[PDB]
Structure 1
Amino acid sequence: STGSATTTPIDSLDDAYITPVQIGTPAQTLNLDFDTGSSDLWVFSSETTASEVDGQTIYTPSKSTTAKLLSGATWSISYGDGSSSSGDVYTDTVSVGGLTVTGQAVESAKKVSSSFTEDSTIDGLLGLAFSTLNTVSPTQQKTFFDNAKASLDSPVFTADLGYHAPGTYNFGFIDTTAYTGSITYTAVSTKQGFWEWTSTGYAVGSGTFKSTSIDGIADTGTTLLYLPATVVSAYWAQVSGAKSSSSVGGYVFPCSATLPSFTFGVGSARIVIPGDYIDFGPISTGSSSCFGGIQSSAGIGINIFGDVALKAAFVVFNGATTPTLGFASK
């Protein structure tokens, strides 16, 4: 079987992408943030503390004829940005763009952090990292992808994120019309539970390509590109008036500047991020200082190829027994 769903930016900056997902019988449609950096499928629900819900669509297990409470199971998750949520666990039928999984763990939020409450457009997350990171206790649960794998024509999913525009998540097949040239595949380490790989280097604008190994994760659930301090300093040094601001928490630049592109290596191939993708607009309404889309990973502990990088490519998540990541220009 296969599935295909359109994913849409939540705002004018592409801060995140939501994808409609059908849960329960009859279907309850929720817009979830597909996150290859985590492994929990959790939703705002009728069980979520009322004061912590602000416009989200909620899942109501009591109205689903296929929902079953998973007795004794709980979940609690903390994201690298300080966000967190927790609750209990149902199993239910979950469908993405025609692809159906029965008995998927649906984690019902009883408590959500403030960052989630304030994001009215995101009804929950759909984790797509490896199932070893799932937080359900005492019995770990599988991701939507792991549960679908056997039924898929090919054990793959692909992310085709748009720049200020809708894109596509496909499950089970590779759309050969969606990219140009060839797909370059590169090895993945699952030892930390992430889609972790090694980039072969970078270039700034029209500069010389620097061959150097950058280990990092492919994370659709992170907005920006987080890279080592040396690389990030080399990029922003090419932007007149750019500086790191401690009060803002990253590199900022004059909104009147033009940004150079950024190239990253995948094996022998190159993915080019246009400079406009790196502009995240004024730091506050009316400001002439703009926030940069390439930031240092020094405080984080791991390099993150977030949406800024991924939306410049067609990306294959190959969940074969030896997993790989594929990148193609588009």
Structure 2
Amino acid sequence: STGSATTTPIDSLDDAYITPVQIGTPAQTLNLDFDTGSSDLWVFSSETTASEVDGQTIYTPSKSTTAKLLSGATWSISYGDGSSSSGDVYTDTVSVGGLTVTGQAVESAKKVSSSFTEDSTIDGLLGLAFSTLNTVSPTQQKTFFDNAKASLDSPVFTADLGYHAPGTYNFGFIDTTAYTGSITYTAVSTKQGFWEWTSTGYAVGSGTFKSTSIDGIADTGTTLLYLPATVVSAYWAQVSGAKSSSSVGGYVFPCSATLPSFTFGVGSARIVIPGDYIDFGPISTGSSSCFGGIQSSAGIGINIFGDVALKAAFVVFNGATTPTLGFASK
């Protein structure tokens, strides 16, 4: 089997991407944030504290003839950006882009943090990291991909995120029309439960390539590119007037600037992030200070190849017995 679904930015800055997912019988379609940095599929629901729902579409398990309470199971998750959610668990039928899993754990939120409430466009998350990170207790549950894997034509999914435009998540096949040149595959460590890999270096604009190992995770659920302070300082030093602002929470730059590109290495291959991808717009409405899309990972504890990086590439998440990651230009 295979599946193919379009993923759409939630706003004009590509702050996140939503993908429609069918849950239950008859189908209830919710727009979920596909997140390769976590492993829970959770949804706003009829059980979510009413004051914490503000415009989201909810899953109502009592209206699904295939929903079953997973008796005794609870979940609770906290994300790197400080947001959180928790609740109980149902199993139900879940379909993405024509690919159907029966008996999928659908985690129903009883509580969500304010960041989730305030984002009316995101109805929940669909985790695509390794199932060892799943938070369901006392019986850990499998991700959608893990459940689908044996049925797929090939045990893979791909992320093809757009810049200020829709893109695609495919399951079970590689669309050879979706990228240019060849796909360069690179090793993955699953020891922390993430799609963790090692970039071979970077360049700023038309500058020379610096060969250096940068360990980090491929994370579709993180907006920006978080890299070591040395790398980030080297990038912003090429933008006149750019500076790190404690008050704002990172690097900002004059909105009058033209941003240089940023290149990252994948083995001997190179992925170029155009400068415009690094512009996240005025820090507040009307400001001439703009927020940067490359930020320091210092004090996150990990480097994160988030959407800023991933949207410059066609990315293969290969879930074979020994997982790997593939990157192609597009």
Global fold match (TM > 0.5): yes
SS at match of 2:206: coil
For 1:329 and 1:323, how far apart are their aligned partners in 2? 21
Alignment match, 1:5: 5
**How many residues matched?**
330
Deviations 1:60-118 (A, max 9, x none): 00000000000000000000010000000000000000000000000000000000000
Residue 304 of structure 1, CA deviation: 0.1
For 1:83 and 1:10, how far apart are their aligned partners in 2? 18
Deviations 1:141-182 (A, max 9, x none): 000000000000000000000000000000000000000000
User: Is 1:99–2:76 an aligned residue pair?
Assistant: no
User: Is 1:203–2:203 an aligned residue pair?
Assistant: yes
SS at match of 2:32: strand
Alignment match, 1:238: 238
SS at match of 2:47: coil
For 1:136 and 1:4, how far apart are their aligned partners in 2? 27
For 1:75 and 1:146, how far apart are their aligned partners in 2? 18
Residue 28 of structure 1, CA deviation: 0.2
For 2:145 and 2:257, how far apart are their aligned partners in 1? 42
Residue 24 of structure 1, CA deviation: 0.1
For 2:97 and 2:203, how far apart are their aligned partners in 1? 37
Deviations 1:185-204 (A, max 9, x none): 00000000000000000000
List 4+ stretches of structure 1 deviating above 6 A: none
For 1:80 and 1:63, how far apart are their aligned partners in 2? 33
SS at match of 1:257: coil
Deviations 1:240-291 (A, max 9, x none): 0000000000000000000000000000000000000000000000000000
For 1:39 and 1:65, how far apart are their aligned partners in 2? 25
User: Is 1:51–2:57 an aligned residue pair?
Assistant: no
Residue 133 of structure 1, CA deviation: 0.1
For 2:165 and 2:75, how far apart are their aligned partners in 1? 34
SS at match of 1:211: strand
For 2:275 and 2:81, how far apart are their aligned partners in 1? 25
Alignment match, 1:61: 61
For 1:11 and 1:192, how far apart are their aligned partners in 2? 31
For 1:246 and 1:57, how far apart are their aligned partners in 2? 36
For 2:29 and 2:221, how far apart are their aligned partners in 1? 20
Alignment match, 1:223: 223
SS at match of 2:147: helix
Residue 31 of structure 1, CA deviation: 0.2
Residue 299 of structure 1, CA deviation: 1.6
SS at match of 1:82: coil
For 2:249 and 2:170, how far apart are their aligned partners in 1? 35
Residue 42 of structure 1, CA deviation: 0.1
User: Is 1:326–2:326 an aligned residue pair?
Assistant: yes
For 1:102 and 1:96, how far apart are their aligned partners in 2? 12
SS at match of 2:233: helix
Residue 295 of structure 1, CA deviation: 0.2
Structure 2 alignment gaps of length 5 or more = none
Residue 53 of structure 1, CA deviation: 0.1
Residue 57 of structure 1, CA deviation: 0.2
SS at match of 2:232: helix
Residue 215 of structure 1, CA deviation: 0.1
For 1:131 and 1:289, how far apart are their aligned partners in 2? 41
For 2:235 and 2:111, how far apart are their aligned partners in 1? 40
